[PDB]
Structure 1
Amino acid sequence: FVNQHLCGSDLVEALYLVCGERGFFYTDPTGGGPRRGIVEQCCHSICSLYQLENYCN
């Protein structure tokens, strides 16, 4: 993994990676791109596990 573009799809994967068993979740689960911090970042820009490492439990 490296600086790549991750969207909700690859987001849950990367998150599914960084979390594995820590139990991850999706923040602001309501409107579209509600947790855009991730959904708008990794998807539009890029981030590292360290980022998704915070989006975990």
Structure 2
Amino acid sequence: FVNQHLCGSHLVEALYLVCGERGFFYTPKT
């Protein structure tokens, strides 16, 4: 689903910014 593919692109960019120093995990599968 490209829609979900696009959204996740945008969600990794927001996590980057919100998490700062701590980092995050990106685990779509789920």
TM-score range, shorter chain: 0.3 to 0.5
CA RMSD of aligned residues (A): 6.4
Which 4+ stretches in 1 moved above 4 angstroms? 1-6
User: For structure 2, which runs of at least 5 residues remain unmatched after alignment?
Assistant: none
Structure with the higher strand share, 1 or 2? 2
Tell me by how many angstroms 1:21 deviates. Answer: 1.2
TM-score, normalising length from structure 1? 0.32
- Number of equivalenced pairs: 27
Choose between structure 1 and 2 for higher RCO, CA contacts under 8 A separated by at least 6 residues: 1
TM-score, normalising length from structure 2? 0.48
